[model samples]
Target: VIKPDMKIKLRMEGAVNGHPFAIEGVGLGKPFEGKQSMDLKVKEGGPLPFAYDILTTVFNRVFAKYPENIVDYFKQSFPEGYSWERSMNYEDGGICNATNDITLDGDCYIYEIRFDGVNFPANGPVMQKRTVKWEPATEKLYVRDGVLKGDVNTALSLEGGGHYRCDFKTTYKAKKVVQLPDYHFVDHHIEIKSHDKDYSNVNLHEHAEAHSGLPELY
Candidate 1:
C-alpha cells in the first residue's frame, strides 16, 4: 500500500567507486518531523524557490550585488523542500533563449533538482553548463539595480540545481565502498517502500497478525 510522505524504505545497489555496493535503510524526507534533511542549495534557490522568490525578487536589488549573496542573505536571516514557478523575467537576465531550448518554460524539470554535476547529458566530458552573467542595465529603466543576474557560475559549484536527498545512517557495510577521486558515474537502482521486511525482522510487523477463527461443526 502507498504510505505517507517521507516514509522511505530505500534499497540502493550502486557504487561509491567502481566497485559495486548496496545500501538499505529506513529514513524520512525533508522537514523530517521538524528539521531539514538536506542543506545544499544552488544559489538562493533552495529546494523550494517559489516560496522564497516572492521575497527574493523584492530583495534582489535593495541589498544583494550578486545572486549567490541571496543564499547568504537567507542564512543571515532565516530558513526547504518543494517548489514552483512564476515565469523568470528580466531579473535573471531572462537568458533562456528558449527558442533553441524550448523546455525552459515547459514544466518543472525534476532532473534539474540535482545540483551535483555527475548526472546525465554532460558533453563528451562536458555537461550543459550555465554560465551566469549579470547585465546591470535594463533599457536604462533599471530600477532592479546591479542585480539583473541569476544564472550559473562555474566557480560556485558544479551547476545550478537543488537537492533531492535524504538523511539516514545506513545499516550496510562501508568496506565495499572505496574512496578515490570522484569521476562519479554509476547506474542508480533505487526501490522505496514504507517498510523493508526482507532487511529487518522488526519491519515484518507490517505483515498481518494471525487470526484463528474456527468453530467446530459437531
Candidate 2:
C-alpha cells in the first residue's frame, strides 16, 4: 500500500579520532539495483567507543593513578618501540569520541589493563554498575552486560570515556561542555513476514480474461 521515497539514497560519513571517512550505502540488497561494497579498516586513534572508552578509561585512570609515564604501563603488552598511533587496531562504532573531552566513571582496580598495542582494557570485573564513560559521541550506543564487540559496539551510537576518582562527570559553560552516554539501536531487526510471498497487483489478469486472452493461463 505504501511506496518508497522520491529518491533512493543512503549516505553516511564520520571521523574516527580525527580520521576522515564516508559511505554510500546501497539499499539492503535491492532486487533490481547493481551490487555494492564497503569496508571498515580499524587502525589508530578510533576513539571507537567501549574499546575506546574502556581504553580511554584505562588510560585516564592509569594516567591519573600512575602519574608516571606511558611506557611501563603499556610495556607489559608491547615492546617499548611500539607506537599505538600506528599499530593499535580499534574498530570504531561504540560511544566514540566526538567531543573535546571524555570521562571514566568507574574505579581503577576493576579494569585489567593490557599492552597488546594500545592501552587495552582486557577485562572488566563487575565491581558494580557505573564504570567508565566515553562522554560525547555521534552514536547513541549502549552496553549489554558490558560486552565490547562489533554488534555490541555499533548500537544506537551516532548510529550511535575516562577518568581518575570517577572524575568522569562533565560540565558545560559557554566555553565548556558536558557529555555522557543510551539504548538499543532499533527493534526493526526482525524478519519481514509481509514480503514472504509474491505480490499480484498487475491489471493484466482481469483485462486479458475479460477481453482477448486467458491471462490466468498466459
The candidate maximizing lDDT is: 2
lDDT of each: 0.19, 0.21
Candidate 2 per-residue lDDT, tens place, 66-168, comes to 1122111211211111111102223421223211222112211111122222222334211111332332221112333322111211121121033312111
- lDDT by residue for model 1 over 89-182, one digit each (tens)? 2222221111000011121111111111112222311222232222121111111231221222111112263221111111111112222111
List where candidate 1 sits over 4 angstroms from the true fold: 1-5, 29-218
What value does the lDDT take at residue 55 in candidate 2? 26
Q: Poorest 10 consecutive residues of model 1 by lDDT?
A: 95-104
What candidate 2 gets wrong by more than 4 Å, as runs, is: 4-7, 28-94, 97-186, 190-218
